[PDB]
Amino acid sequence: IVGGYTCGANTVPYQVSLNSGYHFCGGSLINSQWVVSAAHCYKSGIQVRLGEDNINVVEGNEQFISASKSIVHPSYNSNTLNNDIMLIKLKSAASLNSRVASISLPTSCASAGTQCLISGWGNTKSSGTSYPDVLKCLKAPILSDSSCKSAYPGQITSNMFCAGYLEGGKDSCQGDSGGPVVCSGKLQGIVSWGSGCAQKNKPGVYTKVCNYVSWIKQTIASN
Ligand SMILES: [Ca+2]
């Protein structure tokens, strides 16, 4: 997260870190045994880390649970990043509490102008490289489809939306991938892509979660 703030320990209780020897992506806990992340975060040997603030220090509220399976969206295209969504099942159910909690799926899509919370352990520099140990947060509005398409001609599908600031300086970034965009207590987006980070006229692009609710529910129901 570039231009954000320190969230505070366990203030974003649905935020998970995906770890394969090291943090490589974010995710969102949507029930006791399932996480939603980006399809471009797919790999084998994933451990889901819940209850994290400082990802380098054991602080006492963590639960570390290996993934039993991952399910990348059947229509994910890694070139265009269309359908950039994946489900991860935990080997055992997380113990839910005030600091480890699921986030609700949308019942309807969020509109341009809606304020959302984006979070992660990604790079905090737009030019340099600096990875924080503690969770970073950014409040950012969803942008209009027209402004999103104008920013990224030929690249915005019906399964994507832009959020952030056309002026630059405030954005998600590398390492935030797969993490949540939560608006009015609903998971509306997944950190997917962007051209650099926090660059003028290049806002963050996010997977439009409301398009996948039926797939998520049906997949969970049979797996
Ligand atoms: Ca920790």
Number of domains in the chain: 2
Which DSSP symbol is given to 210? Answer: G
Nearby residues of 13 by Cβ (< 8 Å), 6 or more positions away: 29, 51, 98, 99, 100, 101
Q: Are 68 and 139 in contact (CB under 8 A)?
A: no
Our answer to whether residue 176 is catalytic in this structure is: no
Distance CA 42, CA 197 (A): 22
Residue 71 bridge partners (DSSP): 87
Residues 87 and 128 in one domain: no
**Options 73, 84, 102, 119, the catalytic residue:** 84
Residues 76 and 120 in one domain: no
Residues 109 and 205 in one domain: yes
Distance CA 121, CA 164 (A): 17
Resolution in angstroms comes to 1.7
Our answer to whether residue 40 is catalytic in this structure is: yes
Residues 114 and 171 in one domain: yes
Our answer to whether residue 84 is catalytic in this structure is: yes
Distance CA 105, CA 116 (A): 14
Structure tokens of 127? 């030019």
Residues 22 and 39 in one domain: yes
Residues 53 and 82 in one domain: yes
- Classify each residue of 54-77 as buried b or exposed e, where b means 16 or more C-beta atoms within 10 Å of its C-beta: ebeeeeebbbebebeebbbbeebe
Instruction: Give me the CATH number covering residue 31.
Output: 2.40.10.10
Q: How was this structure determined?
A: X-ray
Distance 57 CA to ligand 1 centre (A): 4
To the question of whether residue 59 is assigned a binding role by annotation, the answer is no
Residues 147 and 95 in one domain: no
136-141, strands of its sheet edge to edge: 5-6, 136-141, 115-120, 180-183, 186-193, 204-208, 160-163
Instruction: Look at residues 170, 144, 169, 164 and name the one whose alpha carbon lies nearest to residue 156.
Output: 144
Q: Which domain holds residue 112?
A: 1-12+103-210
Instruction: Look at residues 119, 120, 102 and name the one whose alpha carbon lies nearest to residue 35.
Output: 102
Residues 181 and 197 in one domain: yes
Residues 133 and 24 in one domain: no
Instruction: Look at residues 161, 175, 174 and name the one whose alpha carbon lies nearest to residue 203.
Output: 161
Residues 176 and 134 in one domain: yes
Identify the H or E element spanning 150: helix 145-151
Residues 47 and 131 in one domain: no
Distance 84 CA to ligand 1 centre (A): 27
Residues 122 and 184 in one domain: yes
